[PDB]
Amino acid sequence: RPRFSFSIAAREGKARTGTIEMKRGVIRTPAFMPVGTAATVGADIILGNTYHLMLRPGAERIAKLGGLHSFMGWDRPILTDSGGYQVMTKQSEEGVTFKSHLDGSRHMLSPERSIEIQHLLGSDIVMAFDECTPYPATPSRAASSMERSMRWAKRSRDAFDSRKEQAENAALFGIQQGSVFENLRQQSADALAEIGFDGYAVGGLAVGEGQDEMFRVLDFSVPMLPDDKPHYLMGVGKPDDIVGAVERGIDMFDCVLPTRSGRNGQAFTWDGPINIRNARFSEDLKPLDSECHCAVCKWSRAYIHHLIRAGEILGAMLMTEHNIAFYQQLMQKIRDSISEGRFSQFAQDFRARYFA
Amino acid sequence: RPRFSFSIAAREGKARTGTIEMKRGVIRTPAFMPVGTAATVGADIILGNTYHLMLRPGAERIAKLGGLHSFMGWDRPILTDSGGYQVMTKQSEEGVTFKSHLDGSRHMLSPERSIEIQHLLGSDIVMAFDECTPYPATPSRAASSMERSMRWAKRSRDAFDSRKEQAENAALFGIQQGSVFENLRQQSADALAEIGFDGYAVGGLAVGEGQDEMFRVLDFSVPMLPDDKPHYLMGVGKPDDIVGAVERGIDMFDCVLPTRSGRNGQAFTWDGPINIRNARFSEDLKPLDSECHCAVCKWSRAYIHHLIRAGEILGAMLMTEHNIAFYQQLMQKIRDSISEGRFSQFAQDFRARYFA
C-alpha cells in the first residue's frame, strides 16, 4: 500500500464513496472514526486523544512504550488531533501555553511541537495545528483567527516535512477555518491548497451553531476544497448531521456523541435516540435496535435497562458497543447506497424513520 | 441429563474434584460461581442476586420477562441466594420485614416467599432461607440463630417440594450455621441431613473472622456434611482462601472480590494482587498476568493502567474480565491437580509464588 492514496469509486450529487489507502490499512469513506479508548479493538481508523495523551502519560512516554499502535493494540490507521482545540491559557503567534490541571506542569503547544507530539504518538493521519475560532465570532476576529491558523498551517507543513519517518509514512491534513463567513472560508481554502495537504478538514464547526447553520456553511465551504482529496468534518455529529454532511461532500467524521451517550443512558436506533434508563424499557424484550446486527442486539432493552439502573459497568459497556456499532452500520449503509446510486432515497427513508 | 447428580472423579486428602450434572448443564467442581451481571456471557454456573432482583425489577416481573435465563441470555445453570443474608429490618419466627430504599415499598421475606421468589427467577440451584449469624456471636445467640435457621430449612424444603416444576427441575441446598462453635455446627449438620438436601452450604463464614478462624471452622465443619453431596462455602474468597478451602473439602465458591476489585483497580495475578493504578505500572509492558490466557493478557499493564487512570469504562471492564478469568484459571488448575494427584504440590507452589 502507498503512504496515502484517496480514490473515489462512486458519486451521487455532492456525496462520494471511496477508499483511502495507507500503509497500515484501507479506510472506507464516508468513514466514522471512533475514540480508540471507547471499546475493545467495523471501524477502519481510530482516534488518539492528543491533548489527553500529552498530559497522561506524555508523548515521550508513549513513544518509549512503542507508540500508540503498540500501546493500544491497534495496528490499523490512527488519526490524532493537533491539540490546540482541546487546550483552548495564554495564546500568541508562537502557540499556546497552559498549565496541566493534573499536576501543575507547564506545557507549550506550537505548530512545531504539535507535529512532534503526533510524530511521537505514531499516528498515521496528523492534523495541522490550528486555532478553533469560538462561536459566534465577528468578521474581524474570525479573519484574524483564520489568518493565524493559515500561518500555523504552513509551519505545520514544514515541521511535518522535516521528519523523514513522518513525511514518508504518515499523512498531513490541513484545517479550514473562517467561522460562518463565506469569504474567509474561501481565503482559508485557497491558503491551504497553495500549501498542499493530503486531506482537508472543515474546522470551526460543531461549536454550538446548530444544524441549519452548519449545513449552510458546508453548502459553500466544501466545494472550495480540492475535490480529489478527502474532506473531514471535525466533531460531527448526530446521525442526521452525518447524513446531511455526506450529502454535502464530507468523507470523514468524528464525534464524542456515541461514547458520551453510551455513558449517560442514550442509545442510537434507526427510530431515533432512546434513553434506556426510562421506565418504559423495563419490560421491553426487543433488542436495542430491531435491525441492528451488533452483538448486543443477544440482549434485550429490558436487560440493558436493568444493568444501567443497577450501576453495573457491563451496562454502560454494552450501550457504548451498540452505539459505536450503530454508527458503523450507518456508515456502511451510506457507502452502499452511494455506490448503488440510491443514497438520496436512503437519506429520505432514514430521516422519515429516525424522526418519526 | 438428570435433575441433579454429583459424582466425585478424584480425591487427594480432603479435596475432591468431580461434576454436578443438571438439566441445563454440567458444573465442574471445585467450581467458582461468578456474579452473572459481571461481564458478557470458563464458568459453568452464574449467580443471580435475589435481594437486588426482588427490589428491581421484582421477581414477578422477571418471571413475566421469561425468567433469569432468558433475561440474562444465559442458558446454563444459575444459583440464587435466599435473600435474607443480604437483607439483614424486623425479624421474627415468620421471616424478615424491611423497607426498600429504592421506593419505600414494604417487603416480607419468609422461607416460603424466598423459595417462591427463586422459583419465579427460574434458578437451578435454590438456597434454603437462613439467618446468617453475625460475627462474633455468643454461644447462646449462635444457638438460637442456628436453631431458627434449621426450622426455616425444613420450611424451605417443604415449600420447594410443593412446586412441582421446581421440585422436578431445580435443586435445593441447605445451609449449615452455628457460628464458630463445633457443637452447634454438628447439630446443624445433623438437622440438615435429616431433612435431606441436594447439596450443603457452609454458611455464616466470610463475615469478618479472618482466614485462620475460617480454616479452623472448616476443619471440623466440612466432615460433618454428607460426603457424597457438594459442599458450598458461601462468600469465599481470596484465591488463597479458595485453595485452603478446597484442601478442606469445599466444592463450590462465590465471592464479591473479583468484581469489586475489578472496579477499584485491583487485579489478581499468580504473583499476588496488584493495584494497577499505581504509578509503577505506567510503563509496564507485561500483560496483567504473565501466564494468564485471558483475552486481556493483548493488553499491557501500562495500557490498562492508563485506561483506569483516565476514567475509561473499558479499563474497569478489562480488569473485571481478567479477574473473573483468573479465578476460573485457578479453579481449572485446582481441578486438574486434584485429578492428577498433585494438588498438595500445586497448593505449596501457588502459595510460595502468590505470597512472594
Ligand SMILES: Nc1nc2c(CCc3ccccc3)c3nc[nH]c3cc2c(=O)[nH]1
Ligand atoms: N483541530 C481542531 N479540532 C476540532 C475538533 C476536535 C476534533 C478531534 C479529532 C481527533 C481527536 C479528538 C478531537 C472539534 N470537535 C468539534 N468541533 C471541532 C472543531 C475542531 C477544529 O476546528 N480544529
Ligand SMILES: Nc1nc2c(CCc3ccccc3)c3nc[nH]c3cc2c(=O)[nH]1
Ligand atoms: N444465605 C446466605 N448467604 C451468605 C452469603 C451470600 C452468598 C450469595 C450467594 C449467591 C448470590 C449472592 C450471595 C455470604 N457472603 C459471604 N458470607 C456469606 C454467608 C452467607 C450465609 O450464611 N447465608
Ligand SMILES: [Zn+2]
Ligand atoms: Zn446493536
Ligand SMILES: [Zn+2]
Ligand atoms: Zn488475564
